Amino acid sequence: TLGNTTSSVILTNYMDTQYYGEIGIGTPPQTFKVVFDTGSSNVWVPSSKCSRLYTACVYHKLFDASDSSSYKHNGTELTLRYSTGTVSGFLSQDIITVGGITVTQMFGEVTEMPALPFMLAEFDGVVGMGFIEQAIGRVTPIFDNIISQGVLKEDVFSFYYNRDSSQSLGGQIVLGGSDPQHYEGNFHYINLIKTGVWQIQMKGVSVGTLLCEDGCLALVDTGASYISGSTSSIEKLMEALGAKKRLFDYVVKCNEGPTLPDISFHLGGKEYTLTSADYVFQESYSSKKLCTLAIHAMDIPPPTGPTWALGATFIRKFYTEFDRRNNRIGFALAR
Ligand SMILES: CCN(C(=O)c1cnc(C)nc1NCc1ccco1)[C@H]1CCCNC1
Numbered sequence: 001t002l003g004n005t006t007s008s009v010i011l012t013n014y015m016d017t018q019y020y021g022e023i024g025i026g027t028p029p030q031t032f033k034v035v036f037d038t039g040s041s042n043v044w045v046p047s048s049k050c051s052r053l054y055t056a057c058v059y060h061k062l063f064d065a066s067d068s069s070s071y072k073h074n075g076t077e078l079t080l081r082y083s084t085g086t087v088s089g090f091l092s093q094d095i096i097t098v099g100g101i102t103v104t105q106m107f108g109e110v111t112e113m114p115a116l117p118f119m120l121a122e123f124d125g126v127v128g129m130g131f132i133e134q135a136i137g138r139v140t141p142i143f144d145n146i147i148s149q150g151v152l153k154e155d156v157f158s159f160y161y162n163r164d165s166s167q168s169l170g171g172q173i174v175l176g177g178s179d180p181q182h183y184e185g186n187f188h189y190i191n192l193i194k195t196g197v198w199q200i201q202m203k204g205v206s207v208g209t210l211l212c213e214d215g216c217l218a219l220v221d222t223g224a225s226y227i228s229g230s231t232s233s234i235e236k237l238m239e240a241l242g243a244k245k246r247l248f249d250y251v252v253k254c255n256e257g258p259t260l261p262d263i264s265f266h267l268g269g270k271e272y273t274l275t276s277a278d279y280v281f282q283e284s285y286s287s288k289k290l291c292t293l294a295i296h297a298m299d300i301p302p303p304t305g306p307t308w309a310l311g312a313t314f315i316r317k318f319y320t321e322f323d324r325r326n327n328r329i330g331f332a333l334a335r
Contacts, residue, residue: 001150006176007099009036011161012122013170016281016294017225019161019312020123021173024097025107026068032061032124036159036173037223038198038322039309041135042080043096043142044108045125047089051111056118063092063109070095078108078137083298088112091137098127099175103146106139129157129222129322133196134304143175147324152176155325159222160334161315178330183319187330190268193217197304198322200267200329205229205308207240208261217307218267219300220320220329224311227279228298233308235297237263243293254284254291263295265310272331278317 009021012033020033025045032045048064050057065071072093079088089110096105110125128141135141147155158178161171172179190200194217202218205211211233229237234250241260243250252260260276276282279294294313300306321330 002153002155003149003151004153005101005151006153006174007101008175008179009099009173010169011036011171011173013162013165013168014122015165016163016312016316018122019171019222021098023127025063026065026094027070028068029097030061030063030067032063033122034125034127035123035223036127036129037221038129039219039221039223040080040082040126041128041130041132041141042078042108042137042139043105043125043127044080044087044089044110046113047109047111049109049111050089050113054113055115056113056121059119060113060121060124065092065094065109068094074106076137080108080136083300085114085117087114087118091139096142098142098146099173101146101149101151101175103142103149105142105145126223130198131196143324146175156321156323158319158321159315160319161312163316178319178321182335183332184335185333187321187332188268188270189323189326189328189330192327192329198329199304199307202308203266204264205233205237206262206264206266206271207237209266210240211236212266212308217305218265219304219307219309220314220322221309221311222315222320224309225294225313226309226311227295227313228300228309228311229295230299230306230308231297233297234295237295241293244290249292249296251290251292252280253287254282254289255287257282257285257291265308265314267331270331272314272318274313274317279313
């Protein structure tokens with residue numbers, strides 16, 4: 001059942017690595033900064049019941065069910081195991097406002113929130129934009145609840161991530177459509193390869209085709225900062241670029257950054273090409289300095305992986321439509 005409404009959420013861009021917007025939970029609304037994440041399916045925010053021995057709970061906005069007159073208890077425990085870290089807590093229900101749309105939503109109140117990585121997060125929590133099939137606890141995701149109301153024009157949502165981390169718009173999510181202000185040319189669509197995941201077939205990864213030669217998978221993950229591949233995939237990619245492996249990233253001498261070759265991802269009969277300016281944090285041009293690349297190793301376990309993940313590095317260049325009605329992802333050139 002489709003309506004006549006389009007809505008948007010304005011996003012903040014923290015340092016090209018974290019894109020997040022505001023949601024309101026409870027009555028009166030308690031405001032949270034949240035990543036809208038196509039790589040997961042659950043909503044969660046940190047809880048007032050989080051021990052303050054978790055220093056991440058000292059430095060973030062905490063949802064207090066005891067301040068909301070529309071809260072409904074559930075209390076079922078949940079653990080969310082991401083590739084970057086784990087959160088745990090319990091289920092609650094309350095009214096959530098996102099882009100002036102109001103829904104009754106089941107979400108996680110997080111009581112265990114490790115310092116790494118969450119002391120490095122500008123955002124407080126996550127809004128899972130994935131499918132109910134990957135929701136821990138089988139909890140109906142927020143976009144499915146919004147769709148139930150019959151207000152949105154289309155069963156789609158779209159992401160714009162800007163390149164500029166103060167006057168500028170950091171990014172934008174359109175619920176119920178896409179914004180022509182932020183893309184140009186036509187959309188090119190790739191249909192989903194697997195039930196309940198924003199994942200597509202990829203036909204090759206080229207440097208200057210030396211990877212994914214007989215096919216592989218790409219998770220399109222709005223909640224991830226970087227492009228990732230498996231450890232073995234990224235090892236071969238990075239040897240070809242001449243980059244040095246550190247603990248949590250790969251780097252190149254800053255003077256070498258501009259000389260680095262294009263990296264192309266073959267998706268649905270189009271080649272999607274990033275130049276070095278799209279994947280190098282070009283912080284200086286000195287030979288004495290090291291500059292980090294926005295491509296990291298991430299071994300994602302079954303059944304989602306092994307897989308590449310196309311995060312904000314990719315989405316900055318390519319405006320992305322997530323089409324629930326037709327089970328496809330559309331890309332167009334961002335502006
Ligand atoms: C939100 C948890 N995620 C992060 O990768 C992540 C971890 N830690 C920090 C500090 N930031 C993260 N995301 C920054 C960001 C926001 C939007 C674009 O990138 C992932 C978990 C797996 C599903 N996909 C999302």
